[PDB]
Each structure stands twice: as structure tokens, then as C-alpha cells.
Amino acid sequence: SNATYKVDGKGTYYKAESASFTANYDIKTRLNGPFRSNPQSGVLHPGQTIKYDTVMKQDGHVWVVYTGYSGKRIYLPVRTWDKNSNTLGPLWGIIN
Ligand SMILES: O=C(O)c1ccccc1O
Ligand SMILES: O=C(O)c1ccccc1O
Ligand SMILES: O=C(O)c1ccccc1O
Structure with missing residues (x-):
């Protein structure tokens, strides 16, 4: 599965995509x-738009990654993902 992704040392699938x-x-x-167990950066509220550069699959979700003003990397889950089937849930927003 996830032929277009690479995998890191935690088993996270990742790929560059913007x-x-x-x-x-x-x-x-x-x-x-x-990981949802990680510290919380904050929240996207409805209608807020971020520009991401990396996509990851881990912890039951597809995530997109961007950089905050300070340079901290921020991980945003965008839909569910089942690792054993690669099935994806509905997107939690709009990609354009
Ligand atoms: O589904 C994809 O994104 C894809 C990308 C490259 C090659 C085969 C693929 O299915
Ligand atoms: O499945 C993907 O390749 C994907 C990439 C970015 C955002 C949501 C996604 O499902
Ligand atoms: O932000 C949420 O409430 C949330 C809900 C389901 C899964 C991951 C999540 O971060």
C-alpha cells in the first residue's frame, strides 16, 4: 500500500505535496x-485556510503539514485513514 509515499522511523507514511x-x-x-496524543498546537476554525507542503498517514488519519510563524511545524488531520485497507474517510474541508 501507499506506493507513492515513503515511510519514516515511526511508520508514518509521508510525501511532499503542496x-x-x-x-x-x-x-x-x-x-x-x-499523532493525536501529541501536544496541541491549536485549531483551524471553519473557513480558515492554510498552505501545506507535506502529506502524512499515521494514527488513523491523513494529515497535512505546514509551518507556523515561529517556524514550528504543525500537523493537521484532514480525514480518516485505515492502515490495513488504505480506505479514506470524507475530507474535513476543501482542497484547492
Ligand atoms: O493514486 C495515486 O495518487 C497514484 C499516483 C501515482 C501512481 C499511481 C497512483 O494510483
Ligand atoms: O490521499 C491523499 O493523497 C491526500 C493528500 C492530501 C490531502 C488529503 C489526501 O487524502
Ligand atoms: O479535532 C478533532 O476533534 C479531531 C477529531 C477526530 C480525529 C482527530 C481530530 O483531531
């Missing part, structure tokens, strides 16, 4: 990596 994501929900964002 677009914009506009949230349709309040979505909690994370520091350090694509």
Missing part, C-alpha cells in the same frame, strides 16, 4: 508529529 486546505470544522492541530 496545496491549500480550508477547514469545514474546528480541527485540532498538533505539534511534533501526526
Whole structure:
């Protein structure tokens, strides 16, 4: 599975890909990596748009990654992902 991704030492699938994501929900964002157990960076509120540069699959979700003003990397989950089937849930916002 995930032939177009590489894999890191934590088993996270990742790939460089750039677009914009506009949230349709309040979505909690994370520091350090694509795990809901990680520290919370904050939240995207509906209608807020970020420009991402990396896509990851980990911890039951597809995530997109961007850089905050300070240079901290911020991990935003955008839909569910089942590792054993590669099935994806509906997107939590709009990609354009
Ligand atoms: O689904 C994709 O994104 C894809 C990309 C490259 C080659 C085969 C693929 O299915
Ligand atoms: O931001 C949320 O409430 C959330 C909900 C489901 C899964 C991951 C999440 O960050
Ligand atoms: O499945 C993907 O390749 C993908 C990439 C970016 C955002 C959401 C996604 O499902």
C-alpha cells in the first residue's frame, strides 16, 4: 500500500505535496508529529485556510503539514485513514 509515499522511523507514511486546505470544522492541530496524543498546537476554525507542503498517514488519519510563524511545524488531520485497507474517510474541508 501507499506506493507513492515513503515511510519514516515511526511508520508514518509521508510525501511532499503542496496545496491549500480550508477547514469545514474546528480541527485540532498538533505539534511534533501526526499523532493525536501529541501536544496541541491549536485549531483551524471553519473557513480558515492554510498552505501545506507535506502529506502524512499515521494514527488513523491523513494529515497535512505546514509551518507556523515561529517556524514550528504543525500537523493537521484532514480525514480518516485505515492502515490495513488504505480506505479514506470524507475530507474535513476543501482542497484547492
Ligand atoms: O493514486 C495515486 O495518487 C497514484 C499516483 C501515482 C501512481 C499511481 C497512483 O494510483
Ligand atoms: O479535532 C478533532 O476533534 C479531531 C477529531 C477526530 C480525529 C482527530 C481530530 O483531531
Ligand atoms: O490521499 C491523499 O493523497 C491526500 C493528500 C492530501 C490531502 C488529503 C489526501 O487524502
